[PDB]
Structure formats: C-alpha cells, structure tokens
C-alpha cells in the first residue's frame, strides 16, 4: 500500500509513505503533526480532520479545503497536499491536509519581550493576511494566538479557515477575542477582525489576556469595565432584548489607553528607528473601539504610522483570491470527497 499507520498519542495517523518521522505539534477539535516530505525534501505539517460527523463539522471542513486551495498569500498558510487513505465514497472517513511547517504559535511570542520593530513587523504581516482574505470578502472570524504561526526569521502566517466566511449576522469564536457585535448578536463586517487584532496586540504588550471573561455573558462585563459603557448611539443598534440587558448593566467610565497601556509595558523607544510607544497605543485605541462603525478598517491599520514603515504593495495590494449553503451529511460527505480527489 502507498500509505502506512503510526500511532500519535492514541489516534491513528494513516499517511502517505513520503511523509516520515511524524511528531505531534498541536491539539484541536483536528490533531497536527510535524513531518518530513521525502519527495519534496522539506518539513511539513499534517492535520488530520478527526470531518462529517455532523453538518457543522462538514461545513467547517469544506470551507477549510476550498479556501486553502484558492488563497495564495505570503501571510496565509499554504496548502501543499490533501489526501485520504480510503478508496471509495462509501469507504471515505478521514481527510489529511499537508501544509508548510512553521516553528511556533503566537502564545510563545506573548511570553517574549519584543522590540518595536518585531512587534510592528508581526502586526503588519497579520494585517496583510487579513487584507488578502477581506479583498475576496472573506472574514476570518476566529483570529487568536493559536491560529497565528511564526518562524525564527520573524515571519508570520494565518492558520484557521474553518469559520472563515462572508459578512453576516453562534458561540464558535473564542470568548476572549469575541467582538462586541459577536458577543451582542449584531451583524459583523470585515473590521470584526480588527477587534481580534487589538486583543492580540494588547496581549503582546501586557503578556496576559486583555478581557478575561469567565463565561460568554461575563465577557461583556470585562469589555465595558476597561473601555467604558458604550454611548447611546451604539445602544440604538442593538436588538430590543439585548439592548434592555446592556442598558440595565452598571455604568462604567472605563480607563484611558495611557492607564490601560502605560509606557513601561511597551518596548523602549529605539534610537535606531522612528517607532514609538505613543503610536502603538494610538493604534490600540483605534482597534479597541466597541462600536464597529467608529473602529478603523484593515487599510487604515496598514496606513497607521506604527505599521506603514513596512508597506509593500506586493504583499499589501496583492490580487484577491479567486473563489468559485445548507446540505445533508450525505450531500456534504460527497462534496468533501469531490474536493479531496480534485486536489
């Protein structure tokens, strides 16, 4: 057989013979291994979608597969190969995705003391990845440090495309990174992603989660205590039921960004470049805005003095990815299989 089985913890990894020396790197709710591609003479990451058990997983796996092939960008994780051990549609069970192997999570970077140049450059690349997805009207929706991978040369790529979709109107976004429009059930546009960037940027500066809500409702308490109760113009935009609860909350003044992010928490202003704590804080104050209509866009974030120094139109103005929604599990299984065989 062209394949072979190797146990990783408890689950079985039935991969192509070309992929050798499989080692576990990360966990999910898909298990990821680091391997060596004997044919390509390079290190790879192999994700086993543990995929069509229910209609939710099916849409998540289909989205991941379709978007991974269409998107071709420096700051998006690239698809190298897709395969299945099974030989028929009836046999079909497991889906394996082969990608470029990165050295770490952004969790490790949050436990590091960076200089302005590395923070800025990491954020710039993140924004390039997000701008690319948005140029095709795709919103990531689940940006968090475990979805952001980095290399020792300070390069970065975005990872999860399971929830990635167009602008719309349940609990699938990770709590701490949920924007007010996701927490409060409003409609979300592209800049929902900028709130996630602000939470990640704040985590990098403070080295702790920015809004550590204890549940999905306490998440709102954490945001209004730090930022202040939103103004009545934002309240009018809420559904009457959510609005009554939000207006019933105790009133918060919030804290200034100078008190939330003092100079001492940012890297020292280098004598060798023009990057400054006051610009990083200004950028944070434009991303961590509750009302999405008053919060900046990805483009405005790329134009920001803390980020624009790296601007390169080859990465920042790259052509949009060319993309060519309710089915049963049987219709989905058939749909996944057709895409696996095609690529």
């Amino acid at each position: 057989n062209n394949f072979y089985s190797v146990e990783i913890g408890d689950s079985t990894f039935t991969v192509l013979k070309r992929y050798q020396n499989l080692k576990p790197i990360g966990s999910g709710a898909g298990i990821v291994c680091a391997a060596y591609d004997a044919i390509l003479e390079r290190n790879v990451a192999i994700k086993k979608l543990s995929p069509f058990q229910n209609q939710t997983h099916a849409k998540r796996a289909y989205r991941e597969l379709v978007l991974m092939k269409c998107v071709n960008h420096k700051n998006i994780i690239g698809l190298l190969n897709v395969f299945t051990p099974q030989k028929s549609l009836e046999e079909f069970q497991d889906v394996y995705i082969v990608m470029e192997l990165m050295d770490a999570n952004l969790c490790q970077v949050i436990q590091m003391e960076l200089d302005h140049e590395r923070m800025s450059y990491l954020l710039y690349q993140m924004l390039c990845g997000i701008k690319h997805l948005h140029s095709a009207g795709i919103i990531h929706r689940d940006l968090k440090p475990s979805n952001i991978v980095v290399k020792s040369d300070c390069t970065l790529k975005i990872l999860d495309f399971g929830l990635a979709r167009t602008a719309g109107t349940p609990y699938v976004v990770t709590r701490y990174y949920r924007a007010p429009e996701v927490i409060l059930g409003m409609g979300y546009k592209e800049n929902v992603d900028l709130w996630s960037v602000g939470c990640i940027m704040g985590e990098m500066v403070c080295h702790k989660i920015l809004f550590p809500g204890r549940d999905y409702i306490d998440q709102w308490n954490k945001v209004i205590e730090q930022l202040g109760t939103p103004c009545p113009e934002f309240m009018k935009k809420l559904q009457p039921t959510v609005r009554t609860y939000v207006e019933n909350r105790p009133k918060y003044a919030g804290y200034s960004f100078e008190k939330l992010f003092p100079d001492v928490l940012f890297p020292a202003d280098s004598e060798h470049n023009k990057l400054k704590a006051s610009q990083a804080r200004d950028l944070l104050s434009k991303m961590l805005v509750i009302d999405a209509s008053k919060r900046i866009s990805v483009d405005e974030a790329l134009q920001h003095p803390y980020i624009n120094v790296w601007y390169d139109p080859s990465e920042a103005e790259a052509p949009p990815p060319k993309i060519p929604r309710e089915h049963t599990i049987e219709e989905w299984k058939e749909l996944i299989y057709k895409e696996v065989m095609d690529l």
Partner: peptide, 10 residues
C-alpha cells in the same frame, strides 16, 4: 526593503 529580524523560539 524586506527586514532581517529574529525570534528566539524554543
């Protein structure tokens, strides 16, 4: 131009 930066990753 493309920078020459490093992250000490364990």
């Amino acid at each position: 131009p493309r920078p020459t930066l490093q992250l000490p990753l364990a």
